Amino acid sequence: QSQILKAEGERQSAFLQAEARERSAEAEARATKMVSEAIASGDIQAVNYFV
C-alpha cells in the first residue's frame, strides 16, 4: 500500500511539471521572436561584444 500511494504522488507531480514545461516553452518562443527581430534589423557585432 505504501508503494502504491507513493506512485500516485509522482504521477500528480509529473502532470504539474508538464504544465510548467508548456509555459516555459511559450516564454522561450516569445523571447526568440523579439531578439530575432532586433538582430535582423541592425547588426551582429553588438552580440559578440556582449558575449
Binding site: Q1, S2, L5, K6, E8, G9
Partner: protein
C-alpha cells in the same frame, strides 16, 4: 469394584518447565500478530501523509 483412580500425577521440577513452555509459546503468537497489525496500519497512514 474400585474404578481405580489416579488422584494425582506429579512430574519433577525439570519437566514442568518443558511442559508449560508449550502454552507460553502459543501465547506469544497472538502478541506477535497484533503487533504486526499495528505496524501495518501505522505504515499506511504515514504513506498517505508523505503523498
Amino acid at each position: 469394584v474400585t474404578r481405580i483412580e489416579i488422584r494425582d500425577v506429579r512430574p519433577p521440577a525439570e519437566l514442568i518447565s518443558s511442559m508449560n513452555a508449550q502454552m507460553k509459546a502459543e501465547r506469544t503468537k497472538r502478541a506477535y500478530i497484533l503487533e504486526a497489525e499495528g505496524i501495518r496500519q501505522a505504515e499506511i497512514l504515514k504513506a498517505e501523509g508523505e503523498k
